[PDB]
Amino acid sequence: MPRVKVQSVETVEGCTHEVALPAEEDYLPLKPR
Amino acid sequence: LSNQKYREMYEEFQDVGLMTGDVTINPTASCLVMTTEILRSMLYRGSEVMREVAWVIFDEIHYMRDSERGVVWEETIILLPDNVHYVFLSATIPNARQFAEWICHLHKQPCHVIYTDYRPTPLQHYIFPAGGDGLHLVVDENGDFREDNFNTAMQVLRDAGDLGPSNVFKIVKMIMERNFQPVIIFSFSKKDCEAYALQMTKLDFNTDEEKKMVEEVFSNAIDCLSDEDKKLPQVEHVLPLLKRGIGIHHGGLLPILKETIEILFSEGLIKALFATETFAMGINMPARTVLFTNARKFDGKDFRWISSGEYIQMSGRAGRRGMDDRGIVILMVDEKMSPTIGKQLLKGSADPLNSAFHLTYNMVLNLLRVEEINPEYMLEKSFYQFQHYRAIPGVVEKVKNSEEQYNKIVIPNEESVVIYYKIRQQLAKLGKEIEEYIHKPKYCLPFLQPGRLVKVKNEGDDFGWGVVVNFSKKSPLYVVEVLLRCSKESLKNSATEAAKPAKPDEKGEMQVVPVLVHLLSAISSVRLYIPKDLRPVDNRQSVLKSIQEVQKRFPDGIPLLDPIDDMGIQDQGLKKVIQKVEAFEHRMYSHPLHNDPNLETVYTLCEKKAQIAIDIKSAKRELKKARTVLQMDELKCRKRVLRRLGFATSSDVIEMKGRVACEISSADELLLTEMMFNGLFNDLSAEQATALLSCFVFQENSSEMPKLTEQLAGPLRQMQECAKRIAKVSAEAKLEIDEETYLSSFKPHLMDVVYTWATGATFAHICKMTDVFEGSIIRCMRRLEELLRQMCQAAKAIGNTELENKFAEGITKIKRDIVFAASLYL
Amino acid sequence: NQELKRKLNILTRPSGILVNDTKLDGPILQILFMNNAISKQYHQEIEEFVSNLVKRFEEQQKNDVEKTSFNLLPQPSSIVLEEDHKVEESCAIKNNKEAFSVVGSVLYFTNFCLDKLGQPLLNENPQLSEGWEIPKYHQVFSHIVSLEGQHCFNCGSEEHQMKDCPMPNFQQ
Amino acid sequence: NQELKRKLNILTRPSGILVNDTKLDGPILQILFMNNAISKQYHQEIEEFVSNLVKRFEEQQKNDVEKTS
Amino acid sequence: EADRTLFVGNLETKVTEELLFELFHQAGPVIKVKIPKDKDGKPKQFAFVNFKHEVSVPYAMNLLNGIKLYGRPIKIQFR
RNA sequence: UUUAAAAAAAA
Ligand SMILES: [Zn+2]
C-alpha cells in the first residue's frame, strides 16, 4: 500500500502549487535560489 | 517534434545532441534529445551514457495514455535510478496529484505539482450551424457560456434539418474578409483536407513578394532531392498552393513537404493550413484562428465525438502572443449534433490521465534475462496497480457507510415482512416470465395493429399508454413504433438521445417513439380509431384526448389481452407458469399480514433494505477482488507461452532463443525468432526477405489485396503457417487470442511494392503501383529499415553470418534518395 | 360441455353446407346487431353495404385482377365455428373447417373498437398483408429505446446495380 | 371444454365498462370476419363504413330529429 | 454532369478532340471531350464536350453551330 | 449522327 502525503503549499494566485512527499517525511519550505 | 526541439536547443546552447531511430547527431553531448523508445532501449541495455545523467525532462507526458505506446513510457520511468530528478511537462489534466503521488511512491522523493489554467490571450468560441447564415458567439473571452446564443444556433440547426458552394469556403472567405487570415483548419480526414484545399484554388492570400520568397524557399528546400524526385507530381503540384498562400499538412504527405510547409507557416508565408490533429502538437506554430470542419474522428476503436481534451488541445493553438489581442475558434456543427453534446464539448474539462500498461513479450523476455529482477516488479509498480491502491480506501469507506446505514434501519417483525417480500418478488418474476412468453413474435405481432393500445415501460421509466403505429423486422429484433408522451427535452436533442417519458408536472409532445417489442409491458385490447395522418401536431393531440376518454370510460383500468385464450397460446410452459403464479398468489393472500394496514410503507422500507444489502454485497465483492495484482494471470499465461516454445526455461531462465528474441523490439518477436530458427530465411534472396519483413511492419486499413505472383506467395504462406502454429500454442495456454485476427494482423499489401522498390525501381513508379498515400509508404519503409537493422543484430547474436549478409544487402538496397531524405531541421 | 354448446347458439353453422371453392365460397362477415339506436336504424344500410362488397369484389376480381395467389393463413388466435351435427359428412369436413374460420373479432363502440383475435399477416409484414393500412408519421427519433440506434442506391432497392438500372466523395 | 370456452370468449364483453345513456353509449355491432378473400380484403372498408354510420347518425340525430320514439 | 454536357455531330474525319477542345475553350472552360470509336477504327461522327459551367451550354449554342470545319458544318444537340 | 468510413505513431 502506498504511503504518501499531499501538502498543499501556499502560493500566489494563478497556480496551485502542491507537493506530494512520502508520509514518513516532514514537509519543509523551498529555499530561495 | 524531437527534430524541432533539437533545432531549438541547438540554436540555444549548441552543446546539444540527438538520438532517434532515423539519425544520431553529436551523441557525446551533454543535452541529448531522444524519443522515449530510444531511452527505453538504453535503459534495457544499460548504456554508460545513462550513468552520467542527472535530469530527465519528459515532454507531453499526457501522451502516456496512447493505449499502444503508453507502456513504453512507464517502463522508462520505472527503470531509471532514484538519484535522477524528473521534470514532467504536460497539458492541463485533473488527476495530476495522482501522478505526483505515483512518482513519490516509486522513487521516494518529493514531487511537486504546478497546475495553472492561465492562458496569455483570451479565446472566443463561435458555432457555425449547418445551413445557417452566421457565426454565433457561444463562448465569450470571459469564459461565461452564453446559453441564449447556443439555443438559437441549435434551433437554426434543427430548422434546417427538418426543412460559396461549400460551407468551409464561406467560412474561410469570411475569415479573410474580416482580417482573421492566419487560420488552421482541423479536419479529421486526409481526403477532407485535400478536398477543402483544392476547393480554395481561386483565392490568393499572398502578395507578389511573398510569392517570390515562397518559390525561392521551396526550390532551395527541394534542391536536396535528385532530379527524378523533383519531377514527382507530389512536389510539383503543391507549389501553386503555397504560392497562393494555402497549405496542406497531414500524415499522408511526404515528410519533406510536411517540414517545408511547417517552416513556411512558422514564417508566416502560409495563411490557411488544412491539417489533421497531428499538427496540433507542433511546436511554436500558433495562428489567429482555428476552424473545426467536423467534430467526429475515428480513433483506434471506431468513430466518436472528439473529447473535450482534444478540443482544448487544438483550440489552444489560437491566438498568438502579443501581435493579436484576441483568439478565435470556430466549430462547425452538422445535423447529427445534439445540444447536450455541444454543451459537453464546449464546457467539459480535460480528460484524466489513465494508464495503458499492458504486457509485451519483449518486456517479459528482457526482465527475465536480467537478473535480480522479475516481471512481477514491473507489474507491481506500473501506475496501474497504483491507481487501484489509491481507489481501495474509497470502496472501503463506501462499504462501511453502507453497512452502518443498513444496520441503522429498524424492522419490528422481520421474518413475516421478509416472507411477504419474497413472495411478492416471486410473483413479479413469474409475471416477467409470462410477459416473456407473450412477446414471442409469432403470437403478439398479429395484435400490434396501427391502433392497438399498449403500455411501454422500459425498466425504470414508464411512458404510459400509447397507440401502436407500425412495426418492422429491423436488420431478428422487432422494432414497434408507438405514439407516446415525450419530455420536450429528449425531444429537442433527439439527434442523439433515445427518448424519455414526459415529466409528471409538464405536458409532452406526443411523438412517435421506436421502442423494442419486448418493452411492451401490457398489450391492452382497445383499438382506437387512428387519424390515418399523424404528421400534423394537432392529430397527435386528438389521439391523446381519445386515450384519456377511453381511460375515463373504464374506471378501473383498461382490459388486457389474456395470454391463454385471447392470444391462443397452447404450449404447456405457459400453463405451468400460470399454475405457479396462482399458487403464489393464494399463498400471499392467505398471509396474516396482508389484510393489516400501513404495510405499504413497511414493504417499501424492506425493499430499500434489500437494495442496500445487495449494494453492500457487490461493493465488498469488488473490494475483495481489487486487493490482488491484476495482470498476474496474464503474466503467467505469457510465461507459459514463452517456455512452451523453448524461449523460457522451466526454471524461468532465458534460453538462447529468448536471448535472440530480446533484440527485436520494433515488430513481433515470437514470429521473427521462430522463423529465423526454422530456417525459413536461409533460402530466400534479400528481396523476398525484405518484402516479408515489410509485410511485418505494415498496419493500415486498405483492401487493395494485390496478387503476389511467385516469390511473394510461398514465403507469405509459410509465414501464415508459422503464425497459425503460434496462435494455436498461445490459445492452448489459456491466453485470450482470436486466431483469425492474429493471422490477419500481418497485412502483406505492400509486399510487392517493397519488392519492386528493392529491385531498384524509381519511387514514382512504385507510388503509382498501389493506392496508399506516399507518406504511408515512406513511413513503412523507414520502419522496415530499422527492423532490418535489428534483424542484423539478432543474426549476429545467433552467429549465422548468412542472415547478417542477407539483411545487410536488404538494408543497402532500400536505403536511397527519397525515402530516407534527411530532414531539413537538422 | 352441453351447457356451453347451448350458449354458443349464434356461433353454430349448420353441418351439411356443400362448400366448394373455399377461397371464395364459404361465409363472409357475421354481424351481431346490438341493441342501440344506430344499429336498429341502419340495419338495412349495413346489409346493402355487405351485398355491395360482394358485388364489388366479384366485379374487380373476375375482370381486372388475375393473380389471387398468396394466402393469409389464420393467425394462431382464430377459432372455428362450432357445427351442430345434424348430418354426417365424408371428406368436406376439412374443407368446412378451413372455410368457417373466424380471423378477427371486433366490438364497435362509438369512439373505440374493442378488438380481439387480431388480423393475419404474411411473414410478419404489414406492408405485404391485405387488411393492414399504416398511418403516416415522421419518425423523428431514430434511436431504439433499449438498443443502439438504427446495389443501385439511387433506386433504393438492394437487388440490382446502377449499371443495369431499369428505373433510373472526394477521391481525387 | 377448453376449446369451447375459447370459442365463447368472443361473446364476452368486459366487466367494468361505465355505460350511461344506454341508448347511444354501447356497442354498435360486432363483426366476425371469416376466412375468405372478400372479408380479408375489405377489412378497412368495413371499418370505415361503420365509422361513417356512427357519424351520419350523430349528425342526423343531434341536428334535426326530436322524438325518435 | 449531364446538364453541362453537350452532344455534337457531323464531325469530319480529321476532326480530333484537340480541335474541339481548342474551339470550345473560347466558349467556356472545357472539362473534357469524348469521341467514341465504334468497330471501325476511327472515332464516331458524334462527340461529347463537357463545360465547367452550365451557362456555357446555352451560350455556346447561341454562339457556335453548323461551323464549317474541314468542309462540313457541325451540329450541336443535348442528351 | 446521344460510350464505403478511417485518424495517429516507433525502439
Ligand atoms: Zn436502379
Closest residue by C-alpha to C1' distance, nucleotide F2: E79
F strand bases under 7 Å from protein CB: 1-11
Residue B796's Cβ-count burial label (10 Å; 0-12, 13-18, 19+) is middle
Per the CB < 8 A criterion, the answer to whether B101 and B360 are in contact is no
Q: Which of B477, B492, B534 is nearest to C149 (CA)?
A: B477
State the amino acid at position C31 in one-letter form.
Answer: I
Q: What is the CA radius of gyration of chain E?
A: 12
B156-192 per-residue burial string, b: 16 or more CB within 10 A, e: under 16: bbbeebeeeeebbeebbeebbeeebbbbbbbbbbbeb
Chain B residues in contact with D5 by the CB 8 A cut-off are: 565
Per the CB < 8 A criterion, the answer to whether C37 and D68 are in contact is yes
Q: Where are the alpha helices (DSSP H) in chain A?
A: none
Strand ranges for B279-326 from DSSP E: 289-292, 296-298, 303-305
Q: Do D24 and C11 touch (CB under 8 A)?
A: no
Residue C25, all three cell numbers: 365460397
* B179: region left, alpha or beta (phi > 0 left; psi from -120 to 50 alpha): left
Rounded Cα–Cα distance for residues A9 and B271 (Å): 45
Gap from B786 CA to F10 C1', Å: 10
DSSP per position, B768-783:
TSS-S-HHHHHHHHHH
Closest nucleotide to B701's CA, by C1' atom?
A: F6
- In sequence order, the β-bridge partners of residue B470 are B481
Per the CB < 8 A criterion, the answer to whether B214 and B243 are in contact is yes
Rounded Cα–Cα distance for residues B399 and B625 (Å): 14
Determine the distance separating the centroid of ligand 1 and the alpha carbon of B475, expressed in angstroms. 22
Q: Where are the alpha helices (DSSP H) in B685-773?
A: 686-696, 714-732, 739-745, 751-759, 763-767
Rounded Cα–Cα distance for residues B526 and B560 (Å): 9
- In sequence order, the β-bridge partners of residue B462 are B457
- In sequence order, the β-bridge partners of residue B523 are B454
Rounded Cα–Cα distance for residues B5 and B59 (Å): 10
Rounded Cα–Cα distance for residues B778 and B782 (Å): 6
Q: Do B529 and C118 touch (CB under 8 A)?
A: no
Per the CB < 8 A criterion, the answer to whether D19 and D25 are in contact is yes
Length of chain C counted residue by residue: 172
Place of cell 551514457: B49
Determine the distance separating the centroid of ligand 1 and the alpha carbon of E47, expressed in angstroms. 27
Residues 6+ apart with CB under 8 A from B624: none
Element (H, E) at B391: helix B385-408
Q: Which of C36, C61, C133 sits opposite D24 (nearest CB)?
A: C36
Determine the distance separating the centroid of ligand 1 and the alpha carbon of C159, expressed in angstroms. 9
Rounded Cα–Cα distance for residues B307 and C166 (Å): 47
Pairing of strands B85-86, B55-56: parallel
Q: Do B565 and D18 touch (CB under 8 A)?
A: no
Determine the distance separating the centroid of ligand 1 and the alpha carbon of C128, expressed in angstroms. 22
Place of cell 408536472: B505
Rounded Cα–Cα distance for residues C119 and C73 (Å): 10
Q: How far is C125 from chain D (nearest CA, A)?
A: 15
Distances (CA, A) of B719 to B524, B672, B713: 63, 9, 10
Q: How far is B536 from chain C (nearest CA, A)?
A: 9
Residue B562, all three cell numbers: 389474456
Chain C residues in contact with D35 by the CB 8 A cut-off are: 26, 74, 78, 98-103
SS3 B34: strand
DSSP state of C162: G
Residues 6+ apart with CB under 8 A from B549: C111
Rounded Cα–Cα distance for residues B359 and C90 (Å): 80
First-to-last alpha carbon distance for chain B, in angstroms, is 12
Rounded Cα–Cα distance for residues B2 and B32 (Å): 10
Residue B612's Cβ-count burial label (10 Å; 0-12, 13-18, 19+) is middle
Q: How far is B466 from chain D (nearest CA, A)?
A: 20
Angle between helices E17-27 and E56-63 in degrees, nearest 10: 100
Element (H, E) at B151: helix B147-162
Length of chain E counted residue by residue: 79
Residue B684, all three cell numbers: 530466400
Distances (CA, A) of B646 to B362, B428, B574, B726: 15, 58, 59, 12
Per the CB < 8 A criterion, the answer to whether B348 and B315 are in contact is no
Q: Which of D10, D30, D37 sits opposite C24 (nearest CB)?
A: D37
- Residue E31 has phi, psi (to 5 degrees) of -65, -50
SS3 B530: coil
DSSP per position, B30-83:
SB--B-HHHHHHHHHHT-GGGTT--EE---SGGGGG-TTSSHHHHHHHHHS-TT
Rounded Cα–Cα distance for residues B468 and B579 (Å): 31
Pairing of strands B303-305, B296-298: antiparallel
Residues 6+ apart with CB under 8 A from B678: B722
Residue B623's Cβ-count burial label (10 Å; 0-12, 13-18, 19+) is middle
Rounded Cα–Cα distance for residues B543 and B483 (Å): 9
Determine the distance separating the centroid of ligand 1 and the alpha carbon of C164, expressed in angstroms. 7
- In sequence order, the β-bridge partners of residue C30 are D32
SS3 D32: strand
Q: What is the CA radius of gyration of chain A?
A: 11
State the amino acid at position E52 in one-letter form.
Answer: K
Residue B542, all three cell numbers: 386528438
Determine the distance separating the centroid of ligand 1 and the alpha carbon of B161, expressed in angstroms. 27
Rounded Cα–Cα distance for residues B396 and B773 (Å): 54
- In sequence order, the β-bridge partners of residue B668 are none
Q: How far is D18 from chain B (nearest CA, A)?
A: 5
Rounded Cα–Cα distance for residues B774 and B253 (Å): 7
Place of cell 403500455: B455
Pairing of strands B289-292, B327-333: parallel
State the amino acid at position C24 in one-letter form.
Answer: L
* Residue in B with minimal Cα distance to A28: B110
If interface means Cβ-Cβ distance under 8 Å, which residues of chain B face chain D?
Answer: 529, 552-556, 559, 562, 565-566, 568
Rounded Cα–Cα distance for residues B534 and C135 (Å): 7
Per the CB < 8 A criterion, the answer to whether C52 and D57 are in contact is no
Query: What is the resolution of the experimental data for this entry, in Å?
Result: 4.1
SS3 B145: strand
Gap from B257 CA to F9 C1', Å: 18
Binding partners of B (≥3 Cβ pairs within 8 A): A, C, D
Per the CB < 8 A criterion, the answer to whether B719 and B695 are in contact is yes
Per the CB < 8 A criterion, the answer to whether E52 and E28 are in contact is yes
The total of other beta-carbon atoms located within 10 Å of residue B767's CB is 20
Four-CA torsion B726, B729, B731, B737, nearest 10 degrees:
-10
- Residue C28 has phi, psi (to 5 degrees) of -130, -170
SS3 A6: strand
Q: How remote is the C-alpha of B40 from its chain's centroid?
A: 25
Rounded Cα–Cα distance for residues B520 and B526 (Å): 15
Chain B residues in contact with A3 by the CB 8 A cut-off are: 105
The total of other beta-carbon atoms located within 10 Å of residue C139's CB is 13
* Residue in B with minimal Cα distance to D48: B529
Rounded Cα–Cα distance for residues B628 and B647 (Å): 28
Gap from B1 CA to F8 C1', Å: 14
Pairing of strands B136-139, C113-116: unpaired
Rounded Cα–Cα distance for residues B117 and B99 (Å): 18
What sign for the dihedral angle of Cα B189, B195, B199, B201? positive
SS3 B453: strand
- Residue B422 has phi, psi (to 5 degrees) of -65, -40
Length of chain B counted residue by residue: 826
Closest residue by C-alpha to C1' distance, nucleotide F11: B37
Per the CB < 8 A criterion, the answer to whether B508 and B486 are in contact is yes
SS3 B447: helix
Per the CB < 8 A criterion, the answer to whether A5 and A22 are in contact is yes
Per the CB < 8 A criterion, the answer to whether B681 and B810 are in contact is no
Residue B258, all three cell numbers: 510536411
Rounded Cα–Cα distance for residues A25 and B331 (Å): 50
Rounded Cα–Cα distance for residues B649 and B109 (Å): 38
Rounded Cα–Cα distance for residues A4 and A2 (Å): 6
Rounded Cα–Cα distance for residues C23 and C28 (Å): 11
Per the CB < 8 A criterion, the answer to whether B756 and B765 are in contact is yes
Rounded Cα–Cα distance for residues E42 and E17 (Å): 12
Closest residue by C-alpha to C1' distance, nucleotide F1: E9
Rounded Cα–Cα distance for residues B587 and C10 (Å): 41
Q: Do B101 and A2 touch (CB under 8 A)?
A: yes
Q: What is the CA radius of gyration of chain B?
A: 33
Rounded Cα–Cα distance for residues B577 and B432 (Å): 10
Rounded Cα–Cα distance for residues B152 and B154 (Å): 6
SS3 C36: coil
Distances (CA, A) of C114 to B514, C117, D10: 24, 11, 11
Residue B528, all three cell numbers: 382506437
Do A and C have ≥3 inter-chain CB pairs under 8 A? no
DSSP per position, chain E:
-TTTEEEEE---TT--HHHHHHHHHHHS-EEEEE--B-TTSSB-S-EEEEESSTTHHHHHHHH-SS--SSSS--EEE--
Q: Which of B154, B122, B125 is nearest to B138 (CA)?
A: B125
What sign for the dihedral angle of Cα C78, C83, C88, C89? negative
Q: Do D16 and B556 touch (CB under 8 A)?
A: yes
Determine the distance separating the centroid of ligand 1 and the alpha carbon of B93, expressed in angstroms. 54
Closest nucleotide to B188's CA, by C1' atom?
A: F7
Rounded Cα–Cα distance for residues D26 and C34 (Å): 8
Rounded Cα–Cα distance for residues E54 and B161 (Å): 29
Residue B264, all three cell numbers: 513556411
First-to-last alpha carbon distance for chain C, in angstroms, is 81
Closest nucleotide to B699's CA, by C1' atom?
A: F9
Per the CB < 8 A criterion, the answer to whether B332 and B130 are in contact is yes
- In sequence order, the β-bridge partners of residue C37 are none
Strand ranges for B412-506 from DSSP E: 453-458, 461-473, 478-484
Rounded Cα–Cα distance for residues B751 and B696 (Å): 9
DSSP state of B708: P
Rounded Cα–Cα distance for residues B495 and B586 (Å): 49
**D27 close to B (CB below 8 A):** no
Q: Which of B652, B92, B582 is nearest to B350 (CA)?
A: B92
D53-65 per-residue burial string, b: 16 or more CB within 10 A, e: under 16: bbeebeeeeeeee
Residue E28, all three cell numbers: 467556356
Gap from C160 CA to F1 C1', Å: 32
